[PDB]
Design a protein around this ligand. Structure first.
Ligand SMILES: [Zn+2]
Ligand SMILES: [Zn+2]
Lengths: 176, 176
């Protein structure tokens, strides 16, 4: 019912040289409360806050989180922004000021109508021991690693209810 | 209205050693028509299809796209999946079989109510020359690099209407 390999590959062009050193730099999610999100992404998931930008006239902040050594963060503001925004695989969290106070407000995780965005995913060396730690930290699960057909694979949720896949690259081969 | 830098840093914990091997492996978007998506991400954006997975009983396919040399893709199926799913900064496109035929169906890009997910972002060497090429390829723009206050920064849309930021890490410093 899907594409054959031939049909999919036929729609794939070789990369034009004008796209050399293009990189997938960021995924942007809106967060209700940056205090809860920064705590979750740093303390639970082990990411580093590499850059914060505030736009007072437009009333929002941007928070860039990445799996980066905090010692590699430049100290010069100009160099720091250029370094942060040239890292692969960053998470950009957008804070619209006031949402944290608004009892009525929440963001949509794209896993109920209307769907689109599904999840971010973290590759971990040990899914079961990562999930044991998540459980002990009181993390909310969508899919415990032992539930359903796909054993050794988990989904958790962040403070806004965004889904985070927890996967082990070797266990994914075997699940085929 | 937002956090001070000190208040943001106050909410950040240092990385637990159990998280030091973790990497931000994927961002998952649902795509209506994988033929249009594969063409756009490979031919326009220069990504490589590194893995295709078909789940007949669940009626979906997964397409993993990444800025990777096609010569680095292992040929052994087991090695290929372990390699693909251990790459940083991949895009996972989910094809729910039949959506391409369904006149009634489309995915939500998260940038109108209900909001959450905002965009993926590509770092390029030269935003103006990247965008000149995008225009000549017929790409739909949300924001041309010279439109609005934020000059030197662009948003395009993919075939499902997902927003893709086109940014240059150095031009972002100056926009502060
Ligand atoms: Zn962005
Ligand atoms: Zn996934």
């Amino acid at each position: 019912g899907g594409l054959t390999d031939e049909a999919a590959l036929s729609c794939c062009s070789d990369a034009d040289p004008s796209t050399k050193d293009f990189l997938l730099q960021q995924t942007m999610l809106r967060v209700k409360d940056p205090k809860k999100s920064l705590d979750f992404y740093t303390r639970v998931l082990g990411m580093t806050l590499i850059q914060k930008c505030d736009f007072p006239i437009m009333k929002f902040s941007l928070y860039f989180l990445a799996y980066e050594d905090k010692n590699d963060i430049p100290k010069e503001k100009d160099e720091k922004i250029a370094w942060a925004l040239s890292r692969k695989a960053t998470l950009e969290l957008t804070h619209n000021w006031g949402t944290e106070d608004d009892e009525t407000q929440s963001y949509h995780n794209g896993n109920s109508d209307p769907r689109g965005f599904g999840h971010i995913g973290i590759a971990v060396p040990d899914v079961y021991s990562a999930c044991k730690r998540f459980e002990e930290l009181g993390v909310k699960f969508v899919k415990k690693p032992d539930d359903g057909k796909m054993k050794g694979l988990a989904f958790i949720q962040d403070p806004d209810g965004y889904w985070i896949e927890i996967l082990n690259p070797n266990k994914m081969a075997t699940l085929m």
